Design an enzyme around this catalytic site. Sequence first.
Site, PDB file in Angstrom:
ATOM      1  NE  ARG A 139       1.185   2.928   8.766  1.00 47.04           N
ATOM      2  CZ  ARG A 139       0.554   2.959   9.945  1.00 47.04           C
ATOM      3  NH1 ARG A 139       1.206   2.679  11.069  1.00 47.04           N
ATOM      4  NH2 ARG A 139      -0.729   3.297   9.996  1.00 47.04           N
TER       5      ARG A 139
ATOM      6  CD  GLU B 118      -2.642   1.120   2.674  1.00 47.97           C
ATOM      7  OE1 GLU B 118      -2.960  -0.015   3.092  1.00 47.97           O
ATOM      8  OE2 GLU B 118      -3.023   2.172   3.232  1.00 47.97           O
TER       9      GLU B 118
ATOM     10  CB  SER C  49      -0.519   5.589   6.944  1.00 54.51           C
ATOM     11  OG  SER C  49      -1.239   4.399   7.229  1.00 54.51           O
TER      12      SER C  49
ATOM     13  CB  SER D 135     -10.528   4.010   6.827  1.00 56.34           C
ATOM     14  OG  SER D 135     -11.091   3.606   5.587  1.00 56.34           O
TER      15      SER D 135
HETATM   16  N1  LIG Z   1     -17.786   9.159  -1.775  1.00 58.11           N
HETATM   17  C1  LIG Z   1     -17.204   8.915  -0.594  1.00 58.11           C
HETATM   18  N2  LIG Z   1     -17.635   7.860   0.133  1.00 58.11           N
HETATM   19  C2  LIG Z   1     -17.053   7.611   1.311  1.00 58.11           C
HETATM   20  N3  LIG Z   1     -16.064   8.277   1.912  1.00 58.11           N
HETATM   21  C3  LIG Z   1     -15.668   9.327   1.179  1.00 58.11           C
HETATM   22  C4  LIG Z   1     -16.159   9.688  -0.071  1.00 58.11           C
HETATM   23  N4  LIG Z   1     -15.500  10.816  -0.533  1.00 58.11           N
HETATM   24  C5  LIG Z   1     -14.633  11.091   0.405  1.00 58.11           C
HETATM   25  N5  LIG Z   1     -14.686  10.237   1.474  1.00 58.11           N
HETATM   26  C6  LIG Z   1     -13.777  10.302   2.618  1.00 58.11           C
HETATM   27  O1  LIG Z   1     -12.597   9.604   2.254  1.00 58.11           O
HETATM   28  C7  LIG Z   1     -12.266   8.626   3.258  1.00 58.11           C
HETATM   29  C8  LIG Z   1     -11.632   7.429   2.600  1.00 58.11           C
HETATM   30  O2  LIG Z   1     -10.413   7.839   1.962  1.00 58.11           O
HETATM   31  P1  LIG Z   1      -9.513   6.828   1.144  1.00 58.11           P
HETATM   32  O3  LIG Z   1      -8.135   7.454   1.010  1.00 58.11           O
HETATM   33  O4  LIG Z   1     -10.208   6.423  -0.116  1.00 58.11           O
HETATM   34  O5  LIG Z   1      -9.392   5.620   2.200  1.00 58.11           O
HETATM   35  P2  LIG Z   1      -9.353   4.065   2.030  1.00 58.11           P
HETATM   36  O6  LIG Z   1      -8.195   3.787   1.109  1.00 58.11           O
HETATM   37  O7  LIG Z   1     -10.636   3.490   1.477  1.00 58.11           O
HETATM   38  N6  LIG Z   1      -9.028   3.523   3.568  1.00 58.11           N
HETATM   39  P3  LIG Z   1      -7.581   2.805   4.041  1.00 58.11           P
HETATM   40  O8  LIG Z   1      -7.764   1.274   3.993  1.00 58.11           O
HETATM   41  O9  LIG Z   1      -7.386   3.212   5.482  1.00 58.11           O
HETATM   42  O10 LIG Z   1      -6.318   3.281   3.233  1.00 58.11           O
HETATM   43  C9  LIG Z   1     -13.575   8.343   3.981  1.00 58.11           C
HETATM   44  O11 LIG Z   1     -13.271   7.966   5.323  1.00 58.11           O
HETATM   45  C10 LIG Z   1     -14.285   9.700   3.935  1.00 58.11           C
HETATM   46  O12 LIG Z   1     -13.887  10.566   4.994  1.00 58.11           O
HETATM   47  N1  LIG Z   2       0.391   4.654  24.071  1.00 58.92           N
HETATM   48  C1  LIG Z   2       0.080   4.470  23.003  1.00 58.92           C
HETATM   49  C2  LIG Z   2      -0.359   4.226  21.566  1.00 58.92           C
HETATM   50  C3  LIG Z   2      -1.668   3.786  21.307  1.00 58.92           C
HETATM   51  C4  LIG Z   2      -2.012   3.568  19.950  1.00 58.92           C
HETATM   52  C5  LIG Z   2      -1.018   3.821  18.989  1.00 58.92           C
HETATM   53  N2  LIG Z   2      -1.317   3.595  17.588  1.00 58.92           N
HETATM   54  C6  LIG Z   2      -2.714   3.548  17.059  1.00 58.92           C
HETATM   55  C7  LIG Z   2      -2.805   2.570  15.892  1.00 58.92           C
HETATM   56  N3  LIG Z   2      -1.786   2.765  14.925  1.00 58.92           N
HETATM   57  C8  LIG Z   2      -2.114   2.938  13.519  1.00 58.92           C
HETATM   58  O1  LIG Z   2      -1.247   3.100  12.726  1.00 58.92           O
HETATM   59  C9  LIG Z   2      -3.603   2.892  13.131  1.00 58.92           C
HETATM   60  C10 LIG Z   2      -3.784   2.558  11.645  1.00 58.92           C
HETATM   61  C11 LIG Z   2      -3.622   1.242  11.204  1.00 58.92           C
HETATM   62  C12 LIG Z   2      -3.790   0.952   9.852  1.00 58.92           C
HETATM   63  C13 LIG Z   2      -4.114   1.972   8.950  1.00 58.92           C
HETATM   64  C14 LIG Z   2      -4.299   1.662   7.450  1.00 58.92           C
HETATM   65  C15 LIG Z   2      -3.618   0.455   6.793  1.00 58.92           C
HETATM   66  C16 LIG Z   2      -5.137   0.471   6.971  1.00 58.92           C
HETATM   67  C17 LIG Z   2      -4.274   3.285   9.399  1.00 58.92           C
HETATM   68  F1  LIG Z   2      -4.587   4.283   8.513  1.00 58.92           F
HETATM   69  C18 LIG Z   2      -4.104   3.577  10.749  1.00 58.92           C
HETATM   70  C19 LIG Z   2      -0.456   2.803  15.395  1.00 58.92           C
HETATM   71  C20 LIG Z   2      -0.308   3.842  16.505  1.00 58.92           C
HETATM   72  N4  LIG Z   2       0.181   4.225  19.311  1.00 58.92           N
HETATM   73  N5  LIG Z   2       0.496   4.425  20.595  1.00 58.92           N
HETATM   74 MG   LIG Z   3      -6.098   3.862   1.317  1.00 59.69          MG
END
Ligand SMILES: Nc1ncnc2c1ncn2[C@@H]1O[C@H](COP(=O)(O)OP(=O)(O)NP(=O)(O)O)[C@@H](O)[C@H]1O
Ligand SMILES: N#Cc1ccc(N2CCN(C(=O)Cc3ccc(C4CC4)c(F)c3)CC2)nn1
Ligand SMILES: [Mg+2]
Lengths: 352, 352
Positions: free
Chosen positions: B190, B121, B178, B175
């Site tokens: 990261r 990713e 990162s 969601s």
């Molecule tokens: N049409 C839409 N539907 C849903 N969410 C949307 C939309 N447009 C914008 N968003 C926002 O965009 C976010 C998702 O962003 P995105 O970068 O596409 O994440 P993702 O790749 O699906 N999640 P992740 O697995 O954490 O990388 C959602 O949490 C909303 O805040």
């Molecule tokens: N005390 C203390 C303490 C408590 C919590 C904490 N963390 C919280 C969790 N976390 C993440 O990265 C969360 C995460 C995971 C995955 C994805 C995407 C790939 C789907 C993300 F956007 C975000 C690491 C840091 N750190 N410290």
């Molecule tokens: Mg994503």
Amino acid sequence: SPWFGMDIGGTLVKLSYFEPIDITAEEEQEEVESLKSIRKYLTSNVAYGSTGIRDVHLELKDLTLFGRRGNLHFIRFPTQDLPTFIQMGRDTVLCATGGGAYKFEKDFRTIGNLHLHKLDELDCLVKGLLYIDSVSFNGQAECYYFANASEPERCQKMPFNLDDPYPLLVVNIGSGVSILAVHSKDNYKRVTGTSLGGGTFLGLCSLLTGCESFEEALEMASKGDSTQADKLVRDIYGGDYERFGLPGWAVASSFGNMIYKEKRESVSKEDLARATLVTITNNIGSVARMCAVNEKINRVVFVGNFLRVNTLSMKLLAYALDYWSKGQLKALFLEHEGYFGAVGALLGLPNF
Amino acid sequence: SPWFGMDIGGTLVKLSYFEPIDITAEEEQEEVESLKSIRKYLTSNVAYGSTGIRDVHLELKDLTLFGRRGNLHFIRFPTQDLPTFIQMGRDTVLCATGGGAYKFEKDFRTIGNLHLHKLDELDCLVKGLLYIDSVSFNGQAECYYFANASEPERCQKMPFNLDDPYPLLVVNIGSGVSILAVHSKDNYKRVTGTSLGGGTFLGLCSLLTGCESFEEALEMASKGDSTQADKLVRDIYGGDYERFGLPGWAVASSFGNMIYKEKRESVSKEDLARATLVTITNNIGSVARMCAVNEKINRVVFVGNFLRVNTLSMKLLAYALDYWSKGQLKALFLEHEGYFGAVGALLGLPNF
Ligand SMILES: Nc1ncnc2c1ncn2[C@@H]1O[C@H](COP(=O)(O)OP(=O)(O)NP(=O)(O)O)[C@@H](O)[C@H]1O
Ligand SMILES: N#Cc1ccc(N2CCN(C(=O)Cc3ccc(C4CC4)c(F)c3)CC2)nn1
Ligand SMILES: [Mg+2]
Ligand SMILES: Nc1ncnc2c1ncn2[C@@H]1O[C@H](COP(=O)(O)OP(=O)(O)NP(=O)(O)O)[C@@H](O)[C@H]1O
Ligand SMILES: N#Cc1ccc(N2CCN(C(=O)Cc3ccc(C4CC4)c(F)c3)CC2)nn1
Ligand SMILES: [Mg+2]
């Protein structure tokens, strides 16, 4: 005058009161009735009015302060009820800290001839923390940690020595969060803060569940499953994200499963309360971890009343700080965690 | 086969599709009907089914890729609807990234003879970001900032040069969040992440207001006043907290005024939506600031679809990062912010 320390926060007023126990027969004669009435009122009651409480278990007994022996009492009530407190006072030198020492300065001055001395919120916190640890908690440690915080069948509260407390990262979880770096008794700074604190927990919980007290919110959270509301790493990947050492159980998106209408319709109030608690607590731990790494400080002590009667958040902090720091940081806790500003204010009395 | 890049996230699927525009007369003869049907379907429609969308304004025109000239298209649909996508495919070499490349690997393999190649990713994100900035946005800058972000009558979007992009802090708001530190084209890590991301905004907003789309949540937030829900420094102190340079307008406790029942009864849905947006956005900026200071990186670029059609959060980040860093950090934004993983996946095609 009676010896009081007051910390007027955004949510709670904390009061430290020194009860002398070495009163001579001559001194008792020379004390005015109203003064004896206050001492009797404070020491013979544990509830004051409908919202004041004395935390009797925290009392320091037979403490020597300003050359006198006495008991140090710890009292709290909602800042919302400060008008009642001031009205009782109208119907003494007051060392006061917290934002309310400034906000309500004019109100305290409605008490005739009363001298209000405003002291800094974080200066009082550092001085009170160091003082209470120095005198001990009636011979027991003031500071504790959770040993083996990663294994629930082993995890247990254990004493921690702060005889050389520097350096120290102090994370004050009140309405919001202040993070302090303490390098010496006279060398400390506010590193940063976050607005996701105890008031966020209580406010969001109340909106989401209809709870009407902090204690009710914690009771709900103790019965809930935060994973009903949160989206976990395993919900996105189907398992761990191995490449970056993220376990499948880690929260990827707080409340992230609540984007689905069918899930919002099935989640319980208790699940939402627990998700609110987990979200706020993990964010506090993460910010503390980042500040500790930047300040090059390995001991992180958490104070403030977000953690009062809140073992869930304490154990979550203990586990999370240890886990995500790979054992480099240690979460520490203090028995008098909500009252250090009030004690520090009291300790400023000789300067006036 | 058609040339596709797919990023299957927790919430959205992002697809990059390269449409060749140098097809010879011989090549058109040799192309099978189903292939021509896909190209016609994708290029003659901007909505696909009920939930797929082509972001026509992002199209890169007359791009040279793998020795061919064509147009690069950007398409998105909800991960919830991936079963529809796969069913259309059943009734090609697929380079795929995101958590869903692992979670749904077995589902993609229900398409006969299809070869699924899973790519990381964050590797795809870095490669796609660097590539799009390198080729430009049809001759315009891919990267922009908000000049004079502190003064609203001056604040304006302006181009930013990334010809030497290293080092760079990349904050991916999907969601969850990162945070990446990029030191070279092949040296990145990261740093950390937070679970308070776009899914928290959407999930909490839906719970608090009953909105049923991201766009509706933003519309509500644009009409709201977050200070009806948040407790500000001035609510606690009566003004600024001068000693630590905290302005009275700063949020001391997110949702902190919602501990009062009368305030919960008067707050509007729009106020709650705006408080949710402000809370999440400020926390992201603060975590980015702390990571930038620890990594010794002064350029912070924000990507991910939390910021799509979300100027409120972009301007809040621009202002907050500049203000709280005392001008030491710069918030940067990219026109193709949601699609870099999908592009990076497509760029992996020659390795197979
Ligand atoms: N049409 C839409 N539907 C849903 N969410 C949307 C939309 N447009 C914008 N968003 C926002 O965009 C976010 C998702 O962003 P995105 O970068 O596409 O994440 P993702 O790749 O699906 N999640 P992740 O697995 O954490 O990388 C959602 O949490 C909303 O805040
Ligand atoms: N005390 C203390 C303490 C408590 C919590 C904490 N963390 C919280 C969790 N976390 C993440 O990265 C969360 C995460 C995971 C995955 C994805 C995407 C790939 C789907 C993300 F956007 C975000 C690491 C840091 N750190 N410290
Ligand atoms: Mg994503
Ligand atoms: N009885 C209670 N009533 C309200 N909140 C409580 C109570 N017990 C614990 N809490 C929690 O404790 C928090 C307040 O902690 P406290 O350290 O007293 O902050 P404060 O000093 O009033 N605020 P601040 O101005 O930011 O320093 C609340 O936000 C709740 O999460
Ligand atoms: N990009 C970026 C970015 C965005 C925001 C941000 N901040 C958020 C606000 N903040 C605080 O300290 C909040 C605070 C204020 C006051 C008190 C108590 C005294 C009452 C607190 F417990 C907490 C500074 C850091 N930092 N960076
Ligand atoms: Mg306080």
